[PDB]
Amino acid sequence: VSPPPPIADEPLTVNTGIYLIECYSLDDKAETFKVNAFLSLSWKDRRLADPVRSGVRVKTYEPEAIWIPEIRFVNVENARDADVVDISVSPDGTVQYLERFSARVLSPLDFRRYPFDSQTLHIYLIVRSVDTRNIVLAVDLEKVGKNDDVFLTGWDIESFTAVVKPANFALEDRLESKLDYQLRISRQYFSYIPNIILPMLFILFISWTAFWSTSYEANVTLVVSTLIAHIFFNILVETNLPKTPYMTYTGAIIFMIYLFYFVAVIEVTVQHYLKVESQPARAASITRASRIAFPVVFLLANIILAFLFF
Amino acid sequence: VSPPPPIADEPLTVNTGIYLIECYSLDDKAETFKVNAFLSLSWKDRRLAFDPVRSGVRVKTYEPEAIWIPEIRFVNVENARDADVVDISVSPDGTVQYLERFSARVLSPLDFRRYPFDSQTLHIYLIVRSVDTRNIVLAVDLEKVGKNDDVFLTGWDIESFTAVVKPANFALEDRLESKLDYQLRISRQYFSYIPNIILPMLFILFISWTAFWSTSYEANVTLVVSTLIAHIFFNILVETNLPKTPYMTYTGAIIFMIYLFYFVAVIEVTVQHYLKVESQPARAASITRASRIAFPVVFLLANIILAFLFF
Amino acid sequence: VSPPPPIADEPLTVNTGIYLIECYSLDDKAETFKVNAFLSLSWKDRRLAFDPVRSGVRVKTYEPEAIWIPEIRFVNVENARDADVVDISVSPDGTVQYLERFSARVLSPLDFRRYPFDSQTLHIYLIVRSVDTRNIVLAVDLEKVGKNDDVFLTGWDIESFTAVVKPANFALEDRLESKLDYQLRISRQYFSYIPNIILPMLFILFISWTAFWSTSYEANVTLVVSTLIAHIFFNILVETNLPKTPYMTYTGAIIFMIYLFYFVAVIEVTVQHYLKVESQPARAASITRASRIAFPVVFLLANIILAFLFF
Amino acid sequence: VSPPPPIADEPLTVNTGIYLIECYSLDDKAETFKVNAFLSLSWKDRRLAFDPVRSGVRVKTYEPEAIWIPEIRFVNVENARDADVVDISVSPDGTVQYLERFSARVLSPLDFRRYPFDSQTLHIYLIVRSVDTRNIVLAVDLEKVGKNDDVFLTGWDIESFTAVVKPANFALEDRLESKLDYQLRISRQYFSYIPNIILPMLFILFISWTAFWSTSYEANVTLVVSTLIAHIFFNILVETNLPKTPYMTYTGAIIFMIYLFYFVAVIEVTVQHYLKVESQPARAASITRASRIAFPVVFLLANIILAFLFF
Amino acid sequence: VSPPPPIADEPLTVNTGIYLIECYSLDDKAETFKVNAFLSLSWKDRRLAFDPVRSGVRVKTYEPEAIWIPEIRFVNVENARDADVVDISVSPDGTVQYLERFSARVLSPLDFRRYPFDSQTLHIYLIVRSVDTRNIVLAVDLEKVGKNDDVFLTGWDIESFTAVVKPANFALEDRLESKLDYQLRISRQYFSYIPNIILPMLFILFISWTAFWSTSYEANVTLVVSTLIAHIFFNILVETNLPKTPYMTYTGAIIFMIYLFYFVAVIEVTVQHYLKVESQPARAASITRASRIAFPVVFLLANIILAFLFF
């Protein structure tokens, strides 16, 4: 088989569509997601073109019987697992191809606002031109969509749209036609509140009870113990995320909280030192100031951080 | 090969059945389960009809390639099913009986609201897309729906395996699609959660309450802080066995509430020490004595409220 | 190809054998094990009879596609076996001798009641479904059932590999099925559990009992709470190596019971401090002295009771 | 099919090119990375030559099976590459232009000496074996070597993708082999190691040094021992992200050295308490005051020495 | 195709060779390693002989399907090898030279007795099953046994790759089997275990011994209990990198013994406090002073005894 010949000099237009059946396994660390979808293709092959004499409105072909464009995905781990569903030819020779495929897609994620982040996942469709003729891709919006039951655990699916204009470019001395299918998602931040955020705030506030205690030994226990629990939360959080060349919102708060523990240790030390030196009136002034300063600076620093990130 | 032609304008009815051989790997975090089953298909193909007398046979056995077979797929699968055709049998009137053994990884959402005292309805959705030649509709042959008695899903009790007899017929890309819903009802075996997570978590909490019979601030700080850290370990342990949910689970609610009890116990321990240092131990004693009753009482009532909201 | 025809009315007997080459990956949590073995099959197909004089050869070698081969499957597998045909030898009378080497991941439930001092009977179920033309039945050729001497299952001792000679013949989806049960008896190597989990867990418990020779409440709180936390770590460690069971395991029972000992030790430490503060140390001393004997004695008797209930 | 015959006695030159589409999964522990790329091949096959005029075609397309194609392999791969032929074009003189898209898991050793401030040269080795008919040699077509601008390797910066133009020709199993070295230069994005591991580890160390402004032995023991345990947690965390090396890494050196600082701080805390108990606090005060300067000073100088030895 | 016929009554000798290209993924817990290698085979097939002067061709290249090839398998593999035929060459006398490149996951038991100062002999067992026509025997062509210089197994030193030249010929299921043993000798790179596990574990133990220069019971309890917990973390860390063994490993022995030292140190700290409370500090002082010498001395001698028993 060979490509359909051009009537004039026009490129062959392959109309495309992707209909999402299943979305699963959005892996934050790997920056991948798995997809199960319908891929629809349409092009004119005049060699395949009478409905009156044939009495048949449509002809069904097997993939091997006809010429089919070599369509690939750019951002996949391995080539897609595809099963042809149907091939239908209209009297004028317009071919309608439908396959169901599954693929693991590589799509970078922006963790800057984590866990209050949104992402635009991409599925890039591509075709390489043949020596005989140039192949160009188009979007049939009537064949772009997603099943209502499509659920991505821990995310809300906003939209699935295609950028209608392909990116046509040369690659290894041939033309290449690339389409961008976009899946907009937003993270379900709910669970982060009772599981990570609030527990982390509770332990921090517990360290601040040391500002109402003169017992150095109890203070050391309060600040050091809670710091260790903060380290456990820091480790827990970093296990759910990849290493980023930037600060994430959570990372910033987690990092800042270390400074609060560090300054609380200095305060607890200074307080004890003065007490030992028979200067408790002064220690009392530092401790009383700390009772206001620590929560106030904590609130303002968080307002500043939320402002820089959102 | 082409589909059986319609005598009038009727849709072709494909009778289906699923017989479960194996159920394994119910992954809570992934919301998947693996299945090994028999898939049975039956439809009328008049072009295959024969006379028993003339042929000298009452049944005809074909190879899948020799005859037309409907393109049946599963909606909620990761990848297409691994299937091996077992038998194809044709009766004199052209009634085809197809049997395949398949294995598949199924995506089926789980409701964790009552975890670990939860029940689930797992779904296996069978689907067929119509052809230009004709419309294909699915039906359930109840005589061919079932499960082996030895089918066990580790950590779960299997209640029933039934099919919703009426298919969901709908248009998808200007073609009729016919969808059947096979339902596997399961209930979680909550037993092990009691000695492994629930009771240990209650023991450490009750141990933090011994601080209400102690005037030693340093010992109290050690009791409340140490047990809080152990509670954090249980919280982490629990969340590793579960996916992130946009709602509160029953266990999650109790785990979260217990933090409030630790937080208030720290305030009490602090207030008690502060008053002692201020030479007002009589007040401190009143707060501590009240706490001995208040903490277990509020804990019990809060748990009755939570169990009520969840069950 | 179609099945061999019956001389009279008898079912077709397919003689089977499994020879284990490798055993690996016994996964306790998954209740699976991987197997690499020879599967031997033998049946008479008179349509393959030949004259050694005419054909030159005394035994014919065939390709699987060239002749009729029974559709033999495993019941308790995750996916269909990975099989490679080693030989298909046909003798003059038409007796087929089929040999394949296969690898498969087998689902076989495990009884954890006596863990880590448990023994198991793993099963490999061979099955054949009957056809319309004729009924197929399985048999065991004991001469072709065995295992390589080098077969080792990491962390287990292999006792025996035998087959239940009588197949289980039954109806399934309006056809006959013939099922054979191959049994691999194994016993767990409990050795490593002693220095890694059991003894460390006993040492920390005995360390908490040193609080019965101390009047220091703050040190006692540190002794009992610290060791309890270490016990939680061991509890977590143990539960990671096991699936969730609707019953108590031997280890689980001991681990759970040890929490009660920590809980009562905290009460004792609290009661002792309370009396000391109330200026009644003579009483506190009587409780502490009694605890020095009571704790180890009750621990020993409770363990004798548990070992008795479990073994 | 057989190799193109030599006009004289020359070896057959196969021109190669690799164009990277995707780079992912650089696994430090495994010392592997996954690659998705275009592999281009070019050679002259006189037997396929044609006249453009009498043919009416300027180029001729063939299926891989129709013509002779060199058996090109990768040396440093886990399994053979997953390849799909994209195009095979033949020009009038019989110059074949082959293009495939492949994916492979590549084994490439990493030097962790300067971790996490390290750079690496990943290798993709292309190989061809000679035939008895003729010697097959590889060449680099620089015009066909490159990478997509969107190529991102999570946690790394990609510097360059170049090929060593001169192949390494050598004998292997009595046939000559022609090997090309494609090099991907990368540098680690060390950013995240600063707020996640480096700074937290420094904070806990500095917190242990507050024991030099405390006379309370019990508080000092708590400060030094608690922070040491947190340092152990960071040590464990770091070693989980790395393979076992027969050398010291930069991070490993700092982590190891910090243990010595904790060990000496414990000795100081012990010596201080011992003297205090012996009624010699003046002395203990001299040791403690010296320690306040000595510990940070020795820490700074030791780090300058280490950075010097490693960079 | 059928096997080459015997000139007299001789078995067919298949000469073998394995050339290692890649060694990776030595998994201690699984007792497996992955291999990528060349497998070379050579046998005489007279039915393929040709005249060198008449033919003009010195060697004839065949496709695997065109000629008879012996069914060579690996005994100790998880699944069948992934193999790609590289070349098939026939010399005038009919000597066949076969070459394939394969990849396989090999099961090979490991002896952990001296871990992490252990050495291993990994095995790759090559096997052939005889045919009815004739017996097939394996031989080693030492000229075709080897390994690439760049072959690196992360965390190990590769010593040698040799083959036991004499095959193990035996009957299995009424046919002869010919087995060859290819041995890869490796020694563990113990370096990293010193700064990561050994030294940190010794530091915490020595820190527990500072309690012998302290009269503070509460500080002593904190020193001994805290370091014991850190020792538990190292015990857990070590056991995660190892499978469960029915014997003691060298590291396991030291780790286990260190628990006894912690246990006795707790007894000493308890006895010391008890005597102090009983107003007998002169005695407590004698026990504490003795402990300062006894603990390090008994530790050193016990380690000399253990090293002696293990090495």
Ligand SMILES: [Cl-]
């Ligand atoms: Cl693709």
Ligand SMILES: [Cl-]
């Ligand atoms: Cl499917």
Ligand SMILES: [Cl-]
């Ligand atoms: Cl099977």
Ligand SMILES: [Cl-]
């Ligand atoms: Cl390759």
Ligand SMILES: [Cl-]
């Ligand atoms: Cl093999």
Ligand SMILES: [Cs+]
């Ligand atoms: Cs085609």
Ligand SMILES: [Cs+]
């Ligand atoms: Cs594929």
Ligand SMILES: [Cs+]
């Ligand atoms: Cs496919």
Ligand SMILES: [Cs+]
């Ligand atoms: Cs829809």
Ligand SMILES: [Cs+]
């Ligand atoms: Cs068909």
Ligand SMILES: [Cs+]
């Ligand atoms: Cs499949």
Ligand SMILES: [Cs+]
């Ligand atoms: Cs299949």
Ligand SMILES: [Cs+]
């Ligand atoms: Cs039924």
Ligand SMILES: [Cs+]
């Ligand atoms: Cs049943």
Ligand SMILES: [Cs+]
């Ligand atoms: Cs239609």
Ligand SMILES: [Cs+]
């Ligand atoms: Cs303490």
